């Protein structure tokens, strides 16, 4: 099961490094664009976990209601992004939002014949990745409340899917 290693690597190699100073970075950003914003950038890292492992390199196309606002400023250096979430045509929220890159690995594997990795396998591992990461975060309260996991599938009944609504539903669980 690749999911297990993938989740631990993601946590140990990335989340555990960046989450500690996140709260300070967004704050610094908030203080300096407070004139322009008011409608402060919310504080947690929102991690998108599309279970179909479909990962554009751009929420700048994923949803008309998600719009790139700005780069969150400040071996590995971290390029986080701030986005506004619209609803009813209005800005309804702003948050640091990104895809869980290990889902790309799972996707690449399923596309790599020698991996012997079926579509059923990939989805199952994606689910296992999400679950494992949740368990990891559960045991690190400090990190668990510095980020939010947003896992989703697009509906079978080809009714319309809203990535922004998915994000907003979590973002409103807090405040």
Binding residues: 9, 14, 76-79, 101
Interface residues toward Ca ion, by CB under 5 A? 156, 158
114 binding partner (options its own copies, Ca ion, none; Cβ < 5 to 8 Å by kind): its own copies
Interface residues toward its own copies, by CB under 8 A? 1-9, 12-13, 102, 104-105, 108-109, 112, 114-115, 136, 139-140
Give min distance, CB of 125 to its own copies, in A. Answer: 8
Give min distance, CB of 166 to its own copies, in A. Answer: 25
- Nearest residue (CB) to its own copies, 132 versus 164: 132
Q: CA-CA distances (angstroms) from residue 16 to 13, 20, 148, 161, 169?
A: 7, 7, 14, 31, 25
CA–CA gap between residue 104 and residue 109 (Å, rounded) = 8
SS3 label, residue 112: coil
Q: At what angle do helices 119-138 and 102-110 cross, to 10 degrees?
A: 160
Give min distance, CB of 79 to its own copies, in A. Answer: 8
* Residue 49 DSSP one-character state: E
Q: CA-CA distances (angstroms) from residue 109 to 99, 113, 118?
A: 17, 8, 9
158 binding partner (options Ca ion, its own copies, none; Cβ < 5 to 8 Å by kind): Ca ion
């Amino acid at each position: 099961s690749v999911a297990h290693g993938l989740a631990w690597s993601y946590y140990i190699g990335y989340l555990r490094l960046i989450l500690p100073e996140l709260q300070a970075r967004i704050r610094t950003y908030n203080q300096h664009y407070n004139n322009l914003l008011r409608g402060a950038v919310s504080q947690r890292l929102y991690i998108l976990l599309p279970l179909d492992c479909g990962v554009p390199d751009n929420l700048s196309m994923a949803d008309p209601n998600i719009r790139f606002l700005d780069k969150l400023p400040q071996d590995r250096v971290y390029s986080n992004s701030i986005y506004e979430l619209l609803e009813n045509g209005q800005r309804a929220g702003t948050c640091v939002l990104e895809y869980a890159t290990p889902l790309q690995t799972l996707f690449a594997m399923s596309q790599y014949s020698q991996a012997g990795f079926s579509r059923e396998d990939r989805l199952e591992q994606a689910k296992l990745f999400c679950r494992t990461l949740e368990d990891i975060l559960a045991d690190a309260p400090e990190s668990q409340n510095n980020c939010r996991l947003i896992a989703y599938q697009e509906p079978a009944d080809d009714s319309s899917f809203s990535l922004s609504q998915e994000v907003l539903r979590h973002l409103r669980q807090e405040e």
